[PDB]
Amino acid sequence: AGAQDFVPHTADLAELAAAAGECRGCGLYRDATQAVFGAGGRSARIMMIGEQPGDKEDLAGLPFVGPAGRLLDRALEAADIDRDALYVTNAVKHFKFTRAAGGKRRIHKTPSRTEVVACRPWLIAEMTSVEPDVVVLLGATAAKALLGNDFRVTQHRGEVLHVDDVPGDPALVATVHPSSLLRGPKEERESAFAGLVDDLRVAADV
Protein backbone atom coordinates (compact mmCIF):
# COMPACT_ATOMS: atom_id res chain seq x y z
CA ALA A 1 0.00 0.00 0.00
CA GLY A 2 1.22 3.45 -0.99
CA ALA A 3 4.80 4.27 -0.11
CA GLN A 4 5.31 1.33 2.28
CA ASP A 5 7.61 -0.83 0.14
CA PHE A 6 9.74 2.20 -0.78
CA VAL A 7 10.61 2.88 2.89
CA PRO A 8 13.91 1.20 3.85
CA HIS A 9 14.46 -0.53 7.19
CA THR A 10 16.59 2.19 8.71
CA ALA A 11 16.06 5.29 10.82
CA ASP A 12 18.98 7.26 9.33
CA LEU A 13 17.34 10.40 7.99
CA ALA A 14 19.89 10.71 5.20
CA GLU A 15 19.10 7.19 3.99
CA LEU A 16 15.36 7.74 4.39
CA ALA A 17 15.56 10.96 2.41
CA ALA A 18 17.56 9.32 -0.40
CA ALA A 19 15.03 6.49 -0.55
CA ALA A 20 12.12 8.97 -0.74
CA GLY A 21 13.76 10.35 -3.87
CA GLU A 22 12.96 7.00 -5.49
CA CYS A 23 9.40 6.74 -4.14
CA ARG A 24 6.54 6.11 -6.56
CA GLY A 25 3.97 5.46 -3.79
CA CYS A 26 1.44 7.78 -5.45
CA GLY A 27 1.26 9.81 -8.67
CA LEU A 28 2.84 12.97 -7.30
CA TYR A 29 6.45 12.05 -8.01
CA ARG A 30 5.84 12.39 -11.77
CA ASP A 31 5.47 16.14 -12.14
CA ALA A 32 7.39 17.31 -9.06
CA THR A 33 11.08 18.09 -9.37
CA GLN A 34 12.17 15.94 -6.43
CA ALA A 35 10.99 14.63 -3.10
CA VAL A 36 11.34 17.07 -0.22
CA PHE A 37 12.13 15.15 2.93
CA GLY A 38 12.11 16.64 6.39
CA ALA A 39 14.96 18.77 7.72
CA GLY A 40 16.59 18.55 11.12
CA GLY A 41 18.11 15.88 13.29
CA ARG A 42 16.98 12.90 15.29
CA SER A 43 17.68 14.58 18.64
CA ALA A 44 14.83 17.01 18.01
CA ARG A 45 12.20 17.15 20.73
CA ILE A 46 9.65 18.97 18.55
CA MET A 47 8.55 17.78 15.12
CA MET A 48 6.50 20.07 12.92
CA ILE A 49 4.46 18.83 9.93
CA GLY A 50 3.00 20.92 7.11
CA GLU A 51 0.94 19.85 4.12
CA GLN A 52 3.46 19.53 1.24
CA PRO A 53 6.42 21.33 -0.29
CA GLY A 54 5.42 24.39 -2.27
CA ASP A 55 7.01 25.91 -5.37
CA LYS A 56 10.11 27.17 -3.55
CA GLU A 57 10.57 23.94 -1.57
CA ASP A 58 10.21 21.73 -4.64
CA LEU A 59 13.33 23.38 -6.09
CA ALA A 60 15.26 24.03 -2.86
CA GLY A 61 14.93 20.46 -1.63
CA LEU A 62 14.07 21.75 1.85
CA PRO A 63 10.78 22.44 3.68
CA PHE A 64 9.42 25.83 4.65
CA VAL A 65 11.80 28.08 2.70
CA GLY A 66 9.25 30.35 1.03
CA PRO A 67 6.82 32.96 2.38
CA ALA A 68 5.06 30.60 4.79
CA GLY A 69 8.44 29.49 6.13
CA ARG A 70 9.52 33.08 6.76
CA LEU A 71 6.36 33.70 8.73
CA LEU A 72 6.88 30.42 10.60
CA ASP A 73 10.42 31.59 11.42
CA ARG A 74 9.05 34.79 12.90
CA ALA A 75 6.56 32.81 15.03
CA LEU A 76 9.25 30.36 16.20
CA GLU A 77 11.59 33.16 17.17
CA ALA A 78 8.77 34.83 19.12
CA ALA A 79 8.08 31.50 20.88
CA ASP A 80 11.81 31.19 21.69
CA ILE A 81 12.09 28.00 19.62
CA ASP A 82 15.30 27.45 17.69
CA ARG A 83 14.39 26.16 14.22
CA ASP A 84 17.71 24.28 14.00
CA ALA A 85 16.54 22.20 16.99
CA LEU A 86 13.29 21.08 15.27
CA TYR A 87 12.55 18.33 12.76
CA VAL A 88 10.37 19.98 10.11
CA THR A 89 8.54 17.95 7.47
CA ASN A 90 5.27 17.64 5.51
CA ALA A 91 2.47 15.10 5.21
CA VAL A 92 3.16 14.60 1.50
CA LYS A 93 6.70 14.76 0.10
CA HIS A 94 6.11 15.73 -3.57
CA PHE A 95 4.60 19.07 -4.64
CA LYS A 96 1.16 18.76 -6.22
CA PHE A 97 0.56 21.80 -8.41
CA THR A 98 -0.75 23.66 -11.41
CA ARG A 99 0.15 26.90 -13.15
CA ALA A 100 -2.17 29.71 -14.11
CA ALA A 101 -1.39 31.79 -17.18
CA GLY A 102 0.16 35.11 -16.24
CA GLY A 103 0.76 33.61 -12.79
CA LYS A 104 3.90 34.36 -10.80
CA ARG A 105 4.32 30.88 -9.33
CA ARG A 106 3.22 27.29 -9.40
CA ILE A 107 0.22 27.03 -7.10
CA HIS A 108 -0.30 24.07 -4.84
CA LYS A 109 -3.26 21.74 -5.11
CA THR A 110 -4.62 19.96 -2.06
CA PRO A 111 -3.47 16.32 -1.68
CA SER A 112 -6.31 13.85 -1.72
CA ARG A 113 -6.84 11.70 1.36
CA THR A 114 -5.57 8.85 -0.80
CA GLU A 115 -2.25 10.66 -1.42
CA VAL A 116 -1.95 11.55 2.27
CA VAL A 117 -2.47 7.93 3.29
CA ALA A 118 -0.10 6.76 0.56
CA CYS A 119 2.70 9.02 1.81
CA ARG A 120 2.08 8.49 5.53
CA PRO A 121 4.58 5.59 5.81
CA TRP A 122 7.31 8.25 5.40
CA LEU A 123 5.84 10.27 8.23
CA ILE A 124 5.68 7.16 10.41
CA ALA A 125 9.32 6.43 9.58
CA GLU A 126 10.25 10.01 10.47
CA MET A 127 8.37 9.82 13.76
CA THR A 128 9.99 6.53 14.73
CA SER A 129 13.38 7.91 13.70
CA VAL A 130 13.09 11.17 15.61
CA GLU A 131 10.97 10.03 18.61
CA PRO A 132 9.69 13.59 19.20
CA ASP A 133 8.11 14.56 22.51
CA VAL A 134 5.56 16.65 20.62
CA VAL A 135 4.30 16.96 17.04
CA VAL A 136 2.95 20.28 15.78
CA LEU A 137 0.49 19.79 12.95
CA LEU A 138 0.40 22.89 10.78
CA GLY A 139 -2.94 23.02 9.00
CA ALA A 140 -5.80 20.72 8.13
CA THR A 141 -4.00 18.16 5.92
CA ALA A 142 -1.20 17.42 8.39
CA ALA A 143 -3.60 17.37 11.33
CA LYS A 144 -5.96 14.98 9.56
CA ALA A 145 -3.07 12.73 8.59
CA LEU A 146 -2.66 11.75 12.25
CA LEU A 147 -5.97 12.72 13.89
CA GLY A 148 -8.48 11.45 11.32
CA ASN A 149 -10.13 12.75 8.17
CA ASP A 150 -12.95 14.47 10.11
CA PHE A 151 -10.62 16.37 12.45
CA ARG A 152 -11.13 20.17 12.62
CA VAL A 153 -8.08 22.29 13.48
CA THR A 154 -10.35 25.26 14.11
CA GLN A 155 -12.13 23.41 16.94
CA HIS A 156 -9.08 22.25 18.96
CA ARG A 157 -6.61 25.06 18.75
CA GLY A 158 -4.43 25.22 21.83
CA GLU A 159 -5.12 21.66 23.01
CA VAL A 160 -2.60 18.93 23.77
CA LEU A 161 -3.88 15.78 22.08
CA HIS A 162 -2.78 12.16 22.26
CA VAL A 163 -4.10 9.33 20.10
CA ASP A 164 -3.28 5.67 20.52
CA ASP A 165 -2.61 5.26 16.76
CA VAL A 166 0.60 7.28 16.75
CA PRO A 167 3.98 5.56 17.31
CA GLY A 168 5.72 6.71 20.47
CA ASP A 169 2.53 8.40 21.77
CA PRO A 170 3.91 11.96 21.39
CA ALA A 171 1.76 14.86 22.39
CA LEU A 172 0.09 16.42 19.34
CA VAL A 173 -0.76 20.08 18.85
CA ALA A 174 -2.78 21.13 15.80
CA THR A 175 -2.49 24.74 14.68
CA VAL A 176 -3.14 27.02 11.75
CA HIS A 177 -0.93 26.68 8.72
CA PRO A 178 1.50 29.64 8.56
CA SER A 179 0.44 30.27 4.95
CA SER A 180 -3.05 31.18 6.21
CA LEU A 181 -1.42 34.11 8.08
CA LEU A 182 0.04 35.62 4.89
CA ARG A 183 -3.20 37.23 3.70
CA GLY A 184 -6.28 38.85 5.20
CA PRO A 185 -6.99 41.98 7.25
CA LYS A 186 -4.06 43.16 9.37
CA GLU A 187 -5.83 42.86 12.75
CA GLU A 188 -6.94 39.33 11.85
CA ARG A 189 -3.43 38.42 10.64
CA GLU A 190 -1.99 39.83 13.89
CA SER A 191 -4.46 37.97 16.09
CA ALA A 192 -3.86 34.76 14.13
CA PHE A 193 -0.07 35.12 14.45
CA ALA A 194 -0.39 35.49 18.24
CA GLY A 195 -2.45 32.32 18.32
CA LEU A 196 0.20 30.45 16.35
CA VAL A 197 2.84 31.61 18.83
CA ASP A 198 0.61 30.36 21.68
CA ASP A 199 0.24 26.92 20.10
CA LEU A 200 3.99 26.68 19.47
CA ARG A 201 4.54 27.56 23.14
CA VAL A 202 2.07 24.85 24.21
CA ALA A 203 4.14 22.37 22.23
CA ALA A 204 7.46 23.64 23.59
CA ASP A 205 6.06 23.47 27.15
CA VAL A 206 5.26 19.75 26.81
Ligand SMILES: O=c1ccn([C@H]2C[C@H](O)[C@@H](COP(=O)(O)O)O2)c(=O)[nH]1
Ligand atom coordinates in the same frame (compact mmCIF):
# COMPACT_ATOMS: atom_id res chain seq x y z
O1 LIG B 1 7.26 23.26 3.77
C1 LIG B 1 6.23 23.66 3.36
C2 LIG B 1 6.19 24.84 2.45
C3 LIG B 1 4.88 25.35 1.94
N1 LIG B 1 3.65 24.69 2.33
C4 LIG B 1 2.39 25.18 1.84
C5 LIG B 1 2.08 26.65 2.48
C6 LIG B 1 1.41 27.24 1.65
O2 LIG B 1 -0.07 26.93 1.86
C7 LIG B 1 1.89 26.66 0.24
C8 LIG B 1 2.89 27.50 -0.32
O3 LIG B 1 3.83 27.82 0.66
P1 LIG B 1 4.47 29.34 0.67
O4 LIG B 1 5.69 29.36 1.57
O5 LIG B 1 3.44 30.31 1.19
O6 LIG B 1 4.87 29.73 -0.73
O7 LIG B 1 2.46 25.34 0.54
C9 LIG B 1 3.69 23.52 3.24
O8 LIG B 1 2.68 22.99 3.56
N2 LIG B 1 4.99 23.01 3.75
Ligand code: SF4
Ligand atom coordinates in the same frame (compact mmCIF):
# COMPACT_ATOMS: atom_id res chain seq x y z
S1 SF4 C 1 3.99 12.16 -2.43
FE1 SF4 C 1 4.83 10.61 -0.94
S2 SF4 C 1 3.86 8.58 -1.51
FE2 SF4 C 1 3.54 10.04 -3.27
S3 SF4 C 1 5.32 9.54 -4.66
FE3 SF4 C 1 5.89 11.29 -3.28
S4 SF4 C 1 7.04 10.42 -1.47
FE4 SF4 C 1 5.90 8.75 -2.55
